[PDB]
Design a protein around this ligand. Sequence first.
Ligand SMILES: CC(=O)Oc1ccccc1C(=O)O
Length: 1218
Amino acid sequence: KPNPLQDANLCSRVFFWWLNPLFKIGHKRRLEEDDMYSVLPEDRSQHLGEELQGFWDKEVLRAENDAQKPSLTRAIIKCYWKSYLVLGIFTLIEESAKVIQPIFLGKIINYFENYDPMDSVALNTAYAYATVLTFCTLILAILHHLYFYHVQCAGMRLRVAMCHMIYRKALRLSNMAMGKTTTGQIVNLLSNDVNKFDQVTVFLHFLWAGPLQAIAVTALLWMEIGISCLAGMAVLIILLPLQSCFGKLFSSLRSKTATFTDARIRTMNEVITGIRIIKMYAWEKSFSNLITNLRKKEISKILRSSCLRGMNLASFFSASKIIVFVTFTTYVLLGSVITASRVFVAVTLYGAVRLTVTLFFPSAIERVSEAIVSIRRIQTFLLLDEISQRNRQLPSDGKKMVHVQDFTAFWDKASETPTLQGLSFTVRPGELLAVVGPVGAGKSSLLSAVLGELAPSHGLVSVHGRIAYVSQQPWVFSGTLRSNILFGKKYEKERYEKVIKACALKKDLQLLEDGDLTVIGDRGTTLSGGQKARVNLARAVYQDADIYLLDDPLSAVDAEVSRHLFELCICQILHEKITILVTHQLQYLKAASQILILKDGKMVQKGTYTEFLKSGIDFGSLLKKGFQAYKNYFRAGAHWIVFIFLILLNTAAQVAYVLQDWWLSYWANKQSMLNTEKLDLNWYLGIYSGLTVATVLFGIARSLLVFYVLVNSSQTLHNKMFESILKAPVLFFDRNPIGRILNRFSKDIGHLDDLLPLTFLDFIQTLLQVVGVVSVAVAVIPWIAIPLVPLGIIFIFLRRYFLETSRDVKRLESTTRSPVFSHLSSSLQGLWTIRAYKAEERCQELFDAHQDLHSEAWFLFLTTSRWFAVRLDAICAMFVIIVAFGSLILAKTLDAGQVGLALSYALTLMGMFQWCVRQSAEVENMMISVERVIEYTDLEKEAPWEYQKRPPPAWPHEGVIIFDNVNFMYSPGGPLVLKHLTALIKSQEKVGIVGRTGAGKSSLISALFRLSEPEGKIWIDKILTTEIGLHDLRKKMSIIPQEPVLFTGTMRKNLDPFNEHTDEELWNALQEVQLKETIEDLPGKMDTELAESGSNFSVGQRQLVCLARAILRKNQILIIDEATANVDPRTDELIQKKIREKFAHCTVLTIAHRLNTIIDSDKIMVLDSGRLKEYDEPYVLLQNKESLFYKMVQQLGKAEAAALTETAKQVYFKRNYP
Ligand SMILES: CC(=O)Oc1ccccc1C(=O)O
């Protein structure tokens, strides 16, 4: 894919003309991967990583020569000082523009001060300064973007080289170094830790330019305004520790918030995961209270953090006002007059140095601090202990064989028990060696030593021949599946086919929809254990090496294909190869001509299968061991009258912001139109400070009120969201995954709470300063409006033209990054499989590809943004040229102050308009969080919780149930699960239920609880389910789910989350379940805060807690849905005892797979495809032995079946005829 940057001239490189052909492709349609350009030859992953590795190897060699800790920063700085110093050269010619440009504004406004129509030479020099002003604005606005691309490109090159190294080392890490760390500690080295090199370079030249820019700003400020500058510079300095104090206090508040926020999100994951449970038990009032209090405590901290961010972002807005008010509060109280040229040179210089000192210098320090942290962490990673490179193959004498002698080594040196103990064996060509030994003998470290992956501690190994390693764990990575099959080797179609069809993969390749060349899903998500096992086996067959170390490869396959390959392929093709094979399976011990047996690193015996059998020693014994969004968003927070007040406060903040500068302008005008006469200093500076304090107060009020209204929008949208998802029918959770909904509560509501209010107030603030600039120009030179409406339209269309591609680039920048981390993650898993093959050469190349492709995406991300920024800055430069020249062609009308105000604002337009547009896009893609949230507030609610027509307070009293033609179905328009269901349940009746789960067992329960309103008619004690409030039905019903769910918090919550009862009944219930000792032996007997879902509890204990809950409820109807499905037999029968003793007076519905559960049945509901076909007493149903009940009973065995039938008859006669 040719890269127009490769062969584009300087003009079409500074203007990114070379990138237009891409926009004309994105405007029409969506950009896919194949449409991205290719990365320059000097940006490939290899070239960069190899240069940096050469420098870093040189530096570690030099340091070890000096015997001092080797520095990685030195390797970097040596590798990237040539490029990143010429970058600094343009940094100088750019910040010197930023600093000199004001000194040209000064000489424009100075011609305006002494304007004389006749002196056309002064006019021409004013045009000269305007032209050089445009020159500065253009080397700042047009040429800044090639420079900024190149700075971000230095950062990209550093990141890519560092990723290449990190990957190479990760490949060469030794188990001693690897097992210490975790694959995550590495993948985060690439994900979040090397991504610190994309940004360090961005401002890494403000380390010496922020200081140097500030010194030159201060020096010019001296030469203009005497000491007066020091006051503004003092406030500007304070913004450094002041912004740092904001940062520290807001980080404290953010972490204190995060505690509450993650408590809320954990409670949310629990309520969503077990939402079915909560609805059934009718507790969502409790969890509603719990999360209402959690969110009130979190919103207190969010509102405090937002108030502080409001006072911060109002201090960035008012910053220049306080900085130029302390500056001319000092400059006028010292006998010096105010002049528009000096004022607006000073305001422009303060804008420059304020951006520099509070946003570019603090950013530079922060990011180089994180970059040094990252460099040191990668340093430690790259100094970790490596494997000893394959003991250099002595040019073989044709001897394909391996001998290990008395090898003893450790997982870790500290262990007194070595992995192996003086083990010696030699394998020569053609020998079929089956390795046998109990688990834990050191299989991993065993073959690691055989591979040479385990450094010697005792013994010695001679290795001559190629090796293919299959680990017990199969391994398959992210990439072309043919990359796995060839494992990076050259393609042989015929032998490829033989390898593929040898494992009978025709079946598996039919299991693949995309055939045998499928691009494997991310990190192998498309394969199971057996599938990856077969992939590994095929890879092994492919290489045809001289050695075959297999660690129980057949554990994932059945005997059929394993025997096929073993006798036809392994014992015929691979037996000629030196096979060292582990095997748990007896079926292939038959085929081991040579067997070698070990026990816990001890040499049991070596010999043939025949000898091992003849010795009398058993194998088993040795082995066995859009615009509705914005409207509905601003409405959810405040009453539209408060939005009118918000608009008025925004406008007044901005009007006072612009009017302090207009007051300096009027001040210059009324000092010029004078003289001896002094200005009314008290009056003029009083109004000046009035406007300044009005601007600061309105900035703070605007920020605080915008944050308050939008955080209140988040709080009200969250309340509606949660009150709608508690009342959202179970269907809305079946159609959606637990993770999708909870994402809307963590990520989306974090945007609405934390970032979207801030991003949106920053957008409004920068937009209103943009409009202040535009309107000052349009109000001093009204004719400017005529150029605007082209620019506006152009801008608008440009912004339409751009955002089409730069949303398909920002999507390619992100959809191609994940492979970079995925290849690392996968290679880390099968690093032993890799290094068994000399393959650090090729897998390095696949990672080089992945990194190159993501660097193509990042190259387009870097360059489309610079294209758009070049054109936005050309818009702003046209603005500056028409306010700079358009003013001088109008100098008869305008006086000094007017031009000062207008142009000083135009110069600020530069960059501030770009931030306006960035923030507009940020809002417009963060308002998808708002749209994706308001999607939930408006959501179909299930029946009301409380109707006005209520049953008697203690209803039901008899526990009678009436089913009449009740049909149920997961969702309207879907398949039915209950079919013409009709049945009576008398008071205190015991009715078992048999059927398939979801074929009518659970659906009938859901209909009973009205999870989804069913067809037909359900009465209880002459009262219908559907016409009564959902709680008034569910609360008075008690149920035990298939899986009993515990909720984090106190045992009292799990027992009585309303605290409507006393501790006496709680302990009665806990004694009934005989967990009384289990809890009283805990520090918090009634306040025992359990682990996550009681993760320190057994399934039986959680089931017993649910039993205690049901006992406490004392409802007249009990429901059990396969509660006896995942319980131990002993506590199972104990629970049966408790249920049959306590709930005797209540009607009981039992849904069980164990038939002991139903011997007490008064009736049994047999469901065939959801139809209640047999409805009688159990033994009566057994009398018709053609009954399905009889079939299922016999399916457990005729002995137990006959015993159960006799017991059923006995209980039948015992009840009916005592
Ligand atoms: C006013 C302005 O936009 O200054 C900036 C320039 C570049 C990036 C960010 C900012 C900012 O406002 O924080």
